[PDB]
Amino acid sequence: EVQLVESGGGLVQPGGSLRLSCAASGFTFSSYAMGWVRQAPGKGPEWVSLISGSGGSTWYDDSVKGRFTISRDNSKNLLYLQMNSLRAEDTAVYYCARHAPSTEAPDYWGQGTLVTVSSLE
Q: Count of domains in the chain?
């Protein structure tokens, strides 16, 4: 019933920019903190950014402060991540995620979108 579908990932050269979107349904959107998880291929997942239910408060991992901007549109149930000045290190699968602190089951994630920062030179 809970659905998370992300869009907008892909290939970009270094210094480029990308915008991820995430559409939700199956729950009351604004009653959950939402965020973005990243997973590099040989590594565990980490939270890259988090936004409060209302969107009044945000958090960013130190490695992305200033470059990435998280936002949400509670009237259309959408979560965004504007990713600027992309660096090779930003390469990973990014997951849209619904943070449920009260739920014991793991958080719901979207299917994941690959983000590759690469110049073939």
A: 1
